Design a protein around this ligand. Structure first.
Ligand code: DCT
Ligand code: DCT
Ligand SMILES: OC[C@H]1O[C@@](CO)(O[C@H]2O[C@H](CO)[C@@H](O)[C@H](O)[C@H]2O)[C@@H](O)[C@@H]1O
Ligand code: MG
Length: 580
DNA sequence: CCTGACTCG
DNA sequence: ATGCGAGTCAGG
């Protein structure tokens, strides 16, 4: 615990070796336009600390940073790349990212800093970030001496941990997943985040003004029906109004009291007309707080752009998550909410939004992995299982299936293949439990391969203690052999779902890499804006639409080659809303 | 701060 | 006990 280093005040030649562990410290969680508090470099020649003003204004250091031939090893390179972009500097040459390495080895570890990654290899010559910066209102950058040693130790750890981590990834056959998929994806996500999505605040604000009025009307209507005023957004107060004052049936209780979830309220619709109004109120209320007010709070005034952050090392299945703001959960299911999408527009005049989504993606992936003849045959015949299920459930013809019915059927298809109980299905379709049980049985009867697969994958998981995806992503499930019925059950269902969702995640990620290269290749101006799990959203001049209508679907469909074909749907328009 | 509500894939 | 994976919000 005695590490010597150089607290430099000027950049030297030895600090620019062609191989180094680099630390560009951004303390603020949201690194967009966030300050860089310090720099640390560790290479063949030594350990150095540099103040941001010093290094980032140095022509040789900036050149080194942007030199792809000068290899850098880091932890969360995207954070540094984006922070540097906001500082007008280009970062190239990142050959190793410890965050992604740790993430691939075991998502469950929740590695959020170098220290946490270090503990995976019994390395402890580095402190946790939280211990150094403190938490909450106490969070602060320590005195230079302390800060300097911290950043240098983190760089030292990355320097010493690279081989051990690559070694383990190599043994798990995940080294290519890191070097050829996640790392190149990281750079793509950095570009996407920095580019941002332009927002039509004039329109969003007008929508918010009108929403407030409509919300106000529903609010009064609710108080009138309840014969009293109360906080509708308080499940507690609401419970008293519904189950005590109004005497409605209590269909479910949670640890804190009566449940007022949407599923329960919808079931109480026949008893009082105040329940439908409350449901509507909550929807409108969510639109206002989150998609109007909340979104407006994160819009960069000067450019009218929103810059989300795609967490690439968080989900347990390989998916990405989106935060501050979350642009992966913008309304679309209900027309009222869907209009929020009219506020998301191109960043340049005469540009359009282009959206492409994978068709029945996880059913296709499951057909491949399970090798279910019927299911594979269905996709080879280009059938729509969601629509068919809709036709069967609602007892209607193909042309009588509304997009809403299809969505409900969609949830039924995925719920069944992922282990929904008869109780769950019955409650969802408001049908007899026996009926639901028969529907499920009949479902696997139709797809025996899938049934066998799910049974086998659970057994494999119990023996190996983990499951894997097509591209070797991994997830450990230690609870799978648990004595407790509940604990075990959840683990088993994770064994049934993770490989499928995870593989779908592997595919779209590769599609993004392939698409990006194709774009830069054809010198097209079109560029990715967002990824929404199984869909990619781009913007580009209208003149490039024709090319994209072929390129995007193609690249996405050819990302990987399965036993069944991949199909991509796509549309474009003046706003994200119109891209339908 | 945790719950339970909304939103999406 | 009762498909999976996520984030943000107001109220507790
Ligand atoms: N050293 C390696 C080897 C493989 N992979 C990932 C890349 C995606 C997938 C490619 O597997 P292949 O080697 O092409 O086939 P395989 O390993 O035989 O796969 P399978 O177990 O399904 O036969 O695994 C990796 O990340 N690192
Ligand atoms: N209720 C849902 C909806 C989606 N998903 C997962 C698997 C499908 C994936 C992508 O979502 P969708 O595109 O809505 O599903 P899809 O099968 O691709 O249906 P569509 O053909 O309309 O794209 O997310 C899920 O687990 N449960
Ligand atoms: O830079 C993203 C990277 O950092 C982690 C851990 O430090 O998450 C931080 O940043 C996220 C985006 O701003 C926040 O949602 C999160 O709260 C904050 O700790 C990793 O999880 C992530 O991969
Ligand atoms: Mg889809």
């Amino acid at each position: 615990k005695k590490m010597a280093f150089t607290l430099a005040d000027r950049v030297t030649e030895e600090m620019l070796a062609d191989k180094a562990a680099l630390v560009v410290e951004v303390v603020e969680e949201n690194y967009h336009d966030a300050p860089i508090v310090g720099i640390a470099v560790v290479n063949e020649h030594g350990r150095f600390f540099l103040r941001p003003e010093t290094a980032l204004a140095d022509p040789q250091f900036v050149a080194w940073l942007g030199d792809e031939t000068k290899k850098k090893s880091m932890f969360d390179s995207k954070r540094a790349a984006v922070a540097l972009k906001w500082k007008g500097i280009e970062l190239c040459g990142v050959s190793f990212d410890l965050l992604l390495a740790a993430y691939l080895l075991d998502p469950a570890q929740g590695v959020d800093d170098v220290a946490a990654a270090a503990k995976m290899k019994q390395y402890e010559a580095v402190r946790p970030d939280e211990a150094v910066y403190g938490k909450g209102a106490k969070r602060a950058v320590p005195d230079e001496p302390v800060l300097a040693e911290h950043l240098v130790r983190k760089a030292a750890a990355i320097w010493e941990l690279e081989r051990p981590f690559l070694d383990e990834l190599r043994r798990n056959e995940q080294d290519r997943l890191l070097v050829e998929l996640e790392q190149p994806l990281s750079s793509i996500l950095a570009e996407m985040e920095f580019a941002g999505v332009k927002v039509d605040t004039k329109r969003l604000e007008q929508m918010g003004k009108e929403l407030a009025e409509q919300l106000g009307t529903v609010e009064q209507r609710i108080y009138e029906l309840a014969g009293q005023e109360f906080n509708i957004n308080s499940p507690k107060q609401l419970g008293v109004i519904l189950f005590e004052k109004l005497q409605l049936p209590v269909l479910k209780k949670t640890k804190t009291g009566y449940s007022t979830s949407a599923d329960v309220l919808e079931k109480l619709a026949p008893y009082h007309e105040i329940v439908e109004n409350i449901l509507h109120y909550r929807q409108l209320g969510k639109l206002q707080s989150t998609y109007i007010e909340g979104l407006l709070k994160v819009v960069r005034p000067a450019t009218k752009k929103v810059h989300t952050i795609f967490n690439q090392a968080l989900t347990q299945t390989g998916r990405l998550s989106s935060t501050e703001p979350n642009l992966q959960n913008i309304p679309i299911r209900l027309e009222e909410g869907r209009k929020i999408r009219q506020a998301f527009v191109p960043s340049e005049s005469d540009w359009l939004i282009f959206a492409a989504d994978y068709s029945q993606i996880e059913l296709r992936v499951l057909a491949h992995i399970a090798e279910d003849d019927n299911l594979m045959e269905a996709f080879r015949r280009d059938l729509d299982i969601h629509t068919k299920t809709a036709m069967d459930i609602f007892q209607v013809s193909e042309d009588e299936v509304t997009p809403n019915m299809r969505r409900q059927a969609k949830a039924v298809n995925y719920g069944i293949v992922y282990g929904i109980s008869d109780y769950g299905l019955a409650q969802n379709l408001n049908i007899s439990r026996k009926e639901a049980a028969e529907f499920i049985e009949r479902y696997f009867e139709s797809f025996p391969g899938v049934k066998r697969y799910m049974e086998n994958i659970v057994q494999e998981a119990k023996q190996k203690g983990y499951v894997t995806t097509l591209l070797h992503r991994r997830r450990y499930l230690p609870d799978i052999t648990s004595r407790n019925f509940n604990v075990r059950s959840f683990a088993e269902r994770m064994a049934m779902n993770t490989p499928i969702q995870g593989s779908a995640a592997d595919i779209i990620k590769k599609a993004m890499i392939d698409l990006n290269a194709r774009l830069k290749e054809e010198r097209l101006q079109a560029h990715l804006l967002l990824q929404v799990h199984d869909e990619l959203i781009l913007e580009a001049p209208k003149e490039e639409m024709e090319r994209l209508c072929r390129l995007v679907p193609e690249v996405m469909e050819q990302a990987v080659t399965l036993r069944v074909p991949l199909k991509v749907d796509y549309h474009y328009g003046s706003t994200w809303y119109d891209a339908k």
